[PDB]
């Protein structure tokens, strides 16, 4: 199918583009979370939230507290969609696909990639925000009232499990490419070139994981099994939104904002 | 890690046990479905009267949709028994903590039933009663109330899964990999399960490479199918819950009830 030297070139191409498209890499996030430092501002309760938006002026959390935080997560997710969209254009073959197929792959893939990349910003105690300048504790997020408290905790539970695989940025760049090129998205017009690119990406990922994690047996297989966890959590997430949308009335934004966050 | 000769021994062990445990193999099912044989032709059920004739040829005071649905429960209980018997042959399974053995079976039997049901399916229907009968997809879809849509997601999965062109020797290892899943909820000792799955995954990877050398990345594509299995299981549980809250004429088998609790 492909020669070993071309797989390394494909892997290197993707790593370089992943560094340019995403501002906060996993490598940089890990330096912040471990204490291998400029200490980030910590949000662990209501009062520290107030000071953080005064001193750092977080653009997501600029109503009621639980709602503002929820809406802030939505604001950042929309920013991330544009970053993933730009990275997708760098995947060899992607821009040559039918234009409707490109849109379909991005529409159905962004939720899985956001959760994946969110794990890079998380440990068991909290999550980095605003390109790593702030840190919101898991306990503060989990203690939000009514449905918002239980909306936040599944992300951590997944992230803790995913991070135990100890992937680095060069591994993640290929993994994310593999997610985008999923030939089973509904409504695809020409599945064949999509699965051909994914076959290339899978070959590159398998060789990457063997060279970069030679002691970690069947890591390739284990990473692929996590695509089940992602799909399952994305479906749960959708059901959580519907329940919020059908119950919370204090959630109306400016109609232009509602449109941006469709 | 394992030596290549030990992986072939494990594949042969597993295929041998699969033949002993499951009386209706994919090889036998395909010979019946393909035809060109006068001694293995099934009786075809496509409407009420042919169902009437079927109980005379194949082999009561109830409704048809119920009768058929109850038939699927009875065969499901038999399948759980066959799958339980196969699992005991998987090296290391019976040595696990007793509660984990129960847990792996509780969550694994459905994913395996849907996998193996695909062997009995084509795009037009499914073999029944040890291959003596064949019930058309259209007839199943036309059953009333909630029962009409009970089978159709299974057909949808089978058409895609069957396009992988697996044979029984491949399926034997794949089924073993499903059972030894270390991410089942409530497992007590995840590590000894994952060590066994690591071995089974290595055996599956080498099996697929030798038996389908031209089918690039079949290993990865097959692992991506565990995502489709998980989702069909979830839909099915929700169909039963709706059935249980309306149909009282239906008792489930205690073995089935226990698997679905939680
Ligand atoms: O920088 C980034 O790459 C980034 C990426 C994502 C997110 C993020 N998305 N998100 C979702 O719920 C989600 C997902 Cl997981 C997927 C799709 C849609 C949404 C939704 F619904 F938001 F639209 C979160 C939930 C939590 C938690 F559950 F732990 F609290 C934490 C973070 C996220 C992100 O958070 C930045 C942020 C967090 C809190 C306040 C202000 C900003 C950064």
Curated annotation (Swiss-Prot), chain B:
Name the UniProt record assigns to this protein: Peroxisome proliferator-activated receptor gamma
Gene name as annotated: PPARG
Signal peptide: none
Keyword Cell membrane: no
NR LBD domain span: 6-262
UniProt note on tissues of expression: Highest expression in adipose tissue. Lower in skeletal muscle, spleen, heart and liver. Also detectable in placenta, lung and ovary.
Any one GO MF annotation of this record: nuclear retinoid X receptor binding
Keywords carried by this UniProt record: Activator, Biological rhythms, Cytoplasm, Diabetes mellitus, Disease variant, DNA-binding, Glycoprotein, Isopeptide bond, Metal-binding, Nucleus, Obesity, Phosphoprotein, Receptor, Transcription, Transcription regulation, Ubl conjugation, Zinc, Zinc-finger
Chain ranges for the short sequence motif 9aaTAD as given in the UniProt record: 254-262
Regulation of protein activity: PDPK1 activates its transcriptional activity independently of its kinase activity.
One GO cellular component term noted in the UniProt record for this chain: chromatin
GO term, biological process aspect, one: epithelial cell differentiation
Parent-protein start and end of this portion: 235 to 503 of 505
Residues involved in rosiglitazone binding: 73-76, 110, 236, 260
Entry similarity comment: Belongs to the nuclear hormone receptor family. NR1 subfamily.
């Amino acid at each position: 199918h492909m020669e070993s030297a071309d797989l390394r070139a494909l892997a290197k191409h993707l790593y370089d583009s992943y560094i340019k498209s995403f501002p906060l890499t996993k490598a940089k996030a890990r330096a912040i979370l471990t204490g291998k430092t400029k200490s980030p501002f910590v949000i662990y309760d209501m009062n520290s939230l107030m000071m953080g938006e005064d001193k750092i002026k977080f653009k997501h959390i600029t109503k009621e507290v639980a709602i503002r935080i929820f809406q802030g997560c939505q604001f950042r997710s929309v920013e991330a969609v544009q970053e993933i969209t730009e990275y997708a254009k760098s995947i060899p073959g992607f821009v040559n696909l039918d234009l409707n197929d490109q849109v379909t792959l991005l529409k159905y893939g962004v939720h899985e990639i956001i959760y994946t990349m969110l794990a890079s910003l998380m440990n068991k105690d909290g999550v980095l925000i605003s390109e790593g300048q702030g840190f919101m504790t898991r306990e503060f997020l989990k203690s939000l009232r009514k449905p918002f408290g239980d909306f936040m905790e599944p992300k951590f539970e997944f992230a803790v499990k995913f991070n135990a695989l100890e992937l680095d940025d060069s591994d993640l760049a290929i993994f994310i490419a593999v997610i985008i090129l999923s030939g089973d998205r509904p409504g695809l017009l020409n599945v064949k070139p999509i699965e051909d690119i994914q076959d290339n990406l899978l070959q590159a990922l398998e060789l990457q994981l063997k060279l970069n994690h030679p002691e970690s047996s069947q890591l390739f297989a284990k990473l692929l099994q996590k695509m089940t966890d992602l799909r399952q959590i994305v479906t749960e997430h959708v059901q959580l939104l519907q329940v919020i949308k059908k119950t919370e009335t204090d959630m109306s934004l400016h109609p232009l904002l509602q449109e941006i966050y469709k």
